[PDB]
Design a protein around this ligand. Structure first.
Ligand SMILES: Cc1cc(CCCOc2c(C)cc(-c3noc(C(F)(F)F)n3)cc2C)on1
Ligand SMILES: Cc1cc(CCCOc2c(C)cc(-c3noc(C(F)(F)F)n3)cc2C)on1
Ligand SMILES: N[C@@H](CCC(=O)N[C@@H](CS)C(=O)NCC(=O)O)C(=O)O
Ligand SMILES: N[C@@H](CCC(=O)N[C@@H](CS)C(=O)NCC(=O)O)C(=O)O
Lengths: 264, 237, 235, 237, 264, 235, 264, 60
């Protein structure tokens, strides 16, 4: 074989069913990257509410019709005002947690339509102005209500009082990539002719073992209608969509006074 | 000292070379890594993931969500094909911008089998049968079911199953095919036809949508890395 | 035998040098008005688009770096004389270190900052750098801010920060000068920097960019119609 | 002779290289060393030595001895803090010029815990209690004892002990922090408050002074050597 | 591992309580650098007065008030006129010795103040003129009396008859460094509310095993008030400070006629 | 793993080249008036401030040295012709050895004194030096004199000496010349000397300089207010 | 011996009678390159008509006289309309086969003449116009009839309607090489005074294990009179020449609809 | 051939260096030495020999 000896001392120089959680119960699931949520490994005492925070919280129901273009949420932003989980978030400097997301949508055998649910790590969205990275904290953290997609890019032509809001586009996924490839991310498809619910399990993903839960969002959830809703020969159709999220294996550290962000 | 003789190629810079160079920051304490989910070892792993195909690239539907949907109806002409395209994973416009196509556009040669999936998004009360056919190159592209059924084909029942899968195997004269358009390395054709028609009862929608996905198999390989044409630049920041 | 996937590996996928910076430096008589006697470049991989697009296939990365420098010089006028071979100084300034304000200030003593002296006409310069990330991996995408506005803040500018940015200054800068004094004739020079990742690990694959880049972020402005026309039943 | 090929980087001078060079004075008889007290093996050993903090940097007291003294009195407003600063060992003006800060200014990255000491220089007849608090970053800087006591804190009794020590542990999201000001790697805040008031008898001074010291612990590390901004030059001798 | 062979023959080319001493007794201590004074190792017969020179000598008492800025002494300069130690110094060409320094200052429970005592090796002080290194031998060797610090730099604007004297500054330690870092040197703190005395043990420190005691001073002692003196509500307060120094393990060599420096 | 202190060692702290000398040498027709045909530089590390400040962290030191020389040449006029490549001679003159009085005197025979001949356009010159201290370690600070005045001295100048100085001549000097004769056109050149300590040992740590240097000693003249303003209760 | 070590990881960088087949019978042979036809080795199910396609087919007889200059055929082109072999060719995308060629020519003892039969792999012929590689598919695939050689190059000087036909030259072998060296190829000589027939066995030769049989011809057969025909003292002499070809070890793959090329 | 990288100091002439150089007169038959009295191995041996001191350096 060919001979090789490394000269320098540095390595760089070298040549190259029912699910019950806590006091909540909901009656196949998808695990992101095949990794179940877990606590920090062996390699300041953390606080861990075993059941006061690891349970299912239900968000506000939304309506799906013939003109809906999609919805998106950010985690852990969406759960900032849910029981003691939010209190622990705002009373500590460092936090960590995984999630279990459950999407519910029921219809009849005479309806038709398909929804795509995508879980995206580090889901960064585009703005609505010539200025770059000018979106504000308040607009980037809607909370429980979340946001919506659009079919076109509407530039905010107002220099007097810029809105500083996102302008996602459905077929660009709001980030400049084609929607067809979004299936690279963890995903589920709800087809009304086969099923009525979707489930995803998300572990903690980040470049650090633990990070602030207030200034950084680890996950994004996007729901988009792949096929339009229809029902018999009716002009208008509307059905509800519900989202339920459960924290799992949550840890907090850095206890001090409480944080009170200015949301408008 | 030691006598030496300089050979051709001295003092040149080849961007694909692999040599050793001094380190400008000696004795650096590197931060240890952690186990982060989602590690990737090979680019082919990305090409094995199914992604939607923008089948409908009509003028008024391209660059829009509707380009991912193919219409089906109970009153369609049963003698005409539903969709047709060519087996050019990297050069065909309907396959070039998929994840498989994006990966292939960084390489010059490709080989292996492909997997196509079709999803039916109608009501539970709709029924029908479809024929999905692949034809190797050499003859006229099929224009009717009689010609298509002579090649490789699969019959799909919508009522029993809402999704169908067809595997296009590797059949070629050369060991590797080019990622660009070339008649000497053409791959074949893919077509779809109605075996039976779509039947729905009363108080049910008569029109529905169908989706398509493509992926690679474990016997897929690429060769001769090269730059892509999907990104350009006109000015430096 | 059977076909192999040797060249589709991450290491093979990133085993090429890519340009990231073109920097102009001039040697001439100093004058009152603005000049390019010394240049300062902020380190980043987003100036160009090829390596950026290749890297953005993944969310997290961890690698070492190999840098190569190619220098090309030329004249500007033809009625002033000639010049002798020049020597170029390239100094790395990490965050917090003092920055030059002139081509011959004390900061060039480089008592602690590493520096390279290059002689024109020789082989292109080359060095290697280890992984210098504060965290356990580099973050190509960061959904968050560096400050959080508070209700008790006196004004709204206390907590204002750019979206999807970690630090104002990251990885420092590079300062390039010509050590030689000025000949009677002006001489211009360009330094091209080529970067090659080594020992690469990646996590969380991501779909590639489909529309032209617009700034360091994910914003898009123009050319949002990439796909072309084709017939539904056309081969 | 032996064929050779010259690679990129030949005939360049990297100031951080490590090669061999000929000696201009061969056969030199070097003077042997002796055992001199005070040998140093690592620069971190200098950062573990406590040094005074110029806490009072007011306009009329900076660059003067009094900048090292903090005033305490029996008639002070018990609802207001005594002193407050930020955990920026290298960029904060009150910590930058300490020995720890001077050492850190030669490096780019730092990590580890810190030790703060406070010395009371009143009379033996004075008594009182103090609260010294550290708050991790993320929330509003404390402005009252009620907010401060929710974070890490220590209660100090002047009468029993004339000196107090508080250890600020390493709690961060990143493995290393920058030595420059940056919100993404902020460290937290340090504050002091009166738990009780200072009580003195008659014929005793009512005002006194307090001193502060800072040092590093055995779990402290630095990275990426760089030049400092604390020394400059305008002309060569 | 990486391969390396050294080619050149030269190493440089290679890539990189009561304490009683003698007839004196004084009723915790600090040892500089954790090294006790010792005689020269095995590696002209030296003279060694075991007890005629190794004993405590007391200097002149000084007064500490509300405006005192500090004091400094140089060793072995301060002991040049102390018994037989000075005679041995001036009768020999080479000398060596360590020291034990004891600082005494007593007050009442109603006083307050803090003193910092620093032992500095090679304590070089700054001048008082534009000319550099122009200080004279007589002014640089005050002797028992010692010198004092100042709160500001007073330039000697007199070219006719320059004084050639030091101009130390308290907050610059007289050498261009901040006082807060002087704790890097061996040090003690005398706080009137806890203690009344300080003790330091200094070994022999120099680049040579033995050196002249007349033209070179090995140690400097600096005393500075870290906190101002105060007493009840009195306008003026003064208390005495005393210094006692004991040579330890002293050796001399090079006997010839006596040396008589011209001190003014 | 756990964090290491590999880069905070003394050897790593001093493992960089630092400039200590910039020397000008000219090649032109000799004339009656003063010229720079040959230059003599006194060896010391106090000309600059970075390496000096780094070294003054300690009272005593012991190390070997690595010296590197970078040469840059240029023209001055443009109506006299051109020149051929020049050769530079650098000679080390220890104390007591004869010193040149002209660019072509016998002293350049360098029969015993070491010398380096450098050809312009080649790699920067480099050499190494061992520890050459008379004592067991180098003394960065020396509190004393070299002479002691005596009562029996005839005058006061017999025993006068500079404070904090050991020897009038220490480590010798370096003499640099251009070996080539003079072309019809003048050519100027600068030699930059970079110094790297190796095999370093130190003793008696010392607080660093806080105010600008003023001469070889510890004297201070101006800018005695380094610290800035800040609030007592301001974060 | 000399020492050598390879440095780079890449290899390129390293320094350098009756014969019966099927239902046919014909009453010494030459094997090309000493390789008998064989099926594909172990290293989509192929179709293989064992006897429906592996049999002797006879082409159209030609006439040899005193002015004939030669004949040529292309395989598998000549057998495109022979029984089920052609059907398999046009019903499949990939094909493979070897051949057995038998040339028959009988005369009397009073005749004289010699024929040379050559089997050429990748037999590429020259055009008849200034334009290069402009020959058409129809003219390059004559089929059973084949083509003929010429004694001179006749340029087609007609830009209005170019013929796009080959213009082979006898002494140049139609490809720019001297005829005398054509014996490098597999060959047979039929001399009327010794024998009356020739036989050659051709294996499958190509850069690929299998290839299309419609757009690529693997073999060419060339027959040329090395010596002119003569008979007694007669002015005109004509005798027949017959060619019979048998496919051997034929495989097909890639079944789809039938291919119908446009031959004029 | 063998990859190599040129380091600083290449193509310089240091008068105190110690390298190998080719011989311009190969196969030369050197004259053998003999035992000559008075061989010297070290210069210090010359400094150990006593010599007269010009003590009286007056003008005349
Ligand atoms: C992700 C990612 C990684 C990077 C670049 C990190 C490396 O940054 C550098 C560079 C480009 C050069 C040097 C450098 N070290 O020395 C020199 C010099 F000697 F050439 F000046 N340059 C040091 C660092 C940390 O940027 N984004
Ligand atoms: C402390 C301290 C240490 C020093 C410098 C000591 C080394 O001095 C030298 C230098 C700088 C160069 C040479 C030298 N030897 O050879 C050459 C030449 F060949 F380049 F001329 N230069 C010799 C000594 C002793 O200065 N202060
Ligand atoms: N032609 C323009 C653009 C030059 C330029 O910098 N082009 C960029 C891309 S927009 C580049 O990478 N050019 C290739 C190179 O010079 O390396 C100019 O000269 O200013
Ligand atoms: N600009 C002035 C100062 C030049 C100079 O020598 N500067 C010193 C510091 S005051 C230096 O080290 N410059 C950097 C270098 O030239 O190496 C001049 O050209 O005379």
């Amino acid at each position: 074989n060919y001979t090789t000896i490394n000269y320098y001392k540095d390595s760089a120089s070298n040549a190259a069913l029912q699910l019950t959680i806590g006091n909540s119960t909901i009656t196949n699931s998808v695990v992101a990257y095949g990794r179940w949520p877990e606590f920090i490994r062996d390699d300041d005492q953390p606080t861990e509410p075993d059941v006061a925070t690891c349970r299912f919280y239900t968000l506000d129901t939304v309506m799906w019709g013939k003109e809906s273009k999609g919805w998106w949420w950010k985690l852990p932003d969406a759960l900032r005002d849910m029981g003691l989980f939010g209190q622990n978030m705002y009373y500590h400097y460092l936090g960590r947690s995984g999630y279990t997301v459950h999407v519910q949508c029921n219809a009849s055998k005479f309806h038709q339509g398909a929804l795509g649910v995508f879980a995206i790590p580090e889901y960064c969205l585009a703005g609505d102005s010539d200025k770059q990275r000018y979106t504000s904290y308040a607009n980037a953290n809607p909370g429980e209500k979340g946001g919506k997609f659009y079919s076109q890019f509407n530039r905010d032509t107002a220099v007097t009082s810029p809105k500083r809001e996102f302008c996602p586009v459905d077929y660009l996924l709001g980030c400049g990539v084609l929607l067809g490839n979004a299936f690279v991310y963890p995903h589920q498809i709800i087809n009304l002719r086969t099923n009525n619910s979707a489930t995803i399990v998300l572990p903690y993903v980040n470049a650090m073992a633990i990070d602030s839960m207030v200034k950084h969002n680890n996950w994004g959830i996007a729901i988009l209608p792949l096929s339009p809703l229809d029902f018999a020969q009716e002009s208008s159709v509307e059905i509800p969509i519900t989202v339920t999220i459960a924290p799992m294996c949550s840890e907090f550290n850095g206890l001090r006074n409480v944080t009170a962000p200015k949301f408008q | 000292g030691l006598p030496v003789l300089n050979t051709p190629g001295s003092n040149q810079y080849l961007t694909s070379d692999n040599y050793q160079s001094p380190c400008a920051i000696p004795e650096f304490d590197v931060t240890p890594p952690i186990d982060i989910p989602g590690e990737v070892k090979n680019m082919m792993e990305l090409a094995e993931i199914d992604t939607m195909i923008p089948l409908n690239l009509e003028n008024t539907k391209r660059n829009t969500m509707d380009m991912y949907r193919v219409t089906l109806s109970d009153s369609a002409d049963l003698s005409q094909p539903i969709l047709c395209f060519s087996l050019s994973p990297a050069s065909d416009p309907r396959l070039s911008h998929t994840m498989l196509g994006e990966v292939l556009n960084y390489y010059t040669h490709w080989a292996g089998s492909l997997k196509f999936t079709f999803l039916f998004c109608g009501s539970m009360m709709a029924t029908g049968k479809i024929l999905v056919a692949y034809a190797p190159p050499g003859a006229q592209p099929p224009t009717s079911r009689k010609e298509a059924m002579l090649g490789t084909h699969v019959i799909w029942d919508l009522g029993l199953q809402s999704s169908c899968t067809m595997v296009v195997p590797w059949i070629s004269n050369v060991t590797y095919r080019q990622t660009t358009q070339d008649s000497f390395t053409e791959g074949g054709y893919i077509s779809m036809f109605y075996q039976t028609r779509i039947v729905v009862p009363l108080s049910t929608p008569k029109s529905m949508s169908m989706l398509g996905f493509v992926s690679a198999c474990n016997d897929f390989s690429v060769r001769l890395l090269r730059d892509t044409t999907h990104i350009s630049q006109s000015a430096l920041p | 035998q059977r076909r192999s996937r040797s060249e589709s590996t991450i290491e093979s996928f990133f085993a090429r040098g890519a340009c990231v910076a073109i920097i102009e430096v001039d040697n001439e008589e100093p004058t009152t008005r603005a000049q390019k006697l010394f240049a300062m470049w902020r380190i980043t991989y987003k100036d160009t688009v090829q390596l950026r697009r290749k890297l953005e296939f993944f969310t997290y990365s961890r690698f070492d770096m190999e840098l190569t420098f190619v220098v090309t010089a030329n004249f500007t006028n033809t009625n002033n004389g000639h010049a002798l071979n020049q020597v170029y100084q390239i100094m790395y300034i990490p965050p917090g270190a003092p920055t030059p304000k002139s081509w011959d200030d004390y900061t060039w003593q480089t008592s602690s900052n590493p520096s390279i002296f290059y002689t024109y006409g020789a082989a292109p310069a080359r060095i290697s750098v280890p992984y210098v990330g504060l965290a356990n991996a580099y973050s190509h995408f960061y959904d968050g801010f560096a400050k959080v506005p508070l209700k008790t803040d006196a004004n709204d500018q206390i907590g204002d920060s750019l979206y999807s940015a970690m630090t104002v200054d990251d990885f420092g800068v590079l300062a390039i000068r010509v050590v030689n004094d000025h000949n009677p004739t002006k001489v211009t020079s360009k330094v091209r920097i080529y970067m090659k990742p080594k020992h690469v690990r990646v996590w969380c694959p991501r779909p590639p960019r489909a529309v032209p880049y617009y700034g360091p972020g994910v914003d898009y402005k123009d050319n949002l119609n990439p796909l072309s026309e084709k017939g539904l039943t056309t081969y």
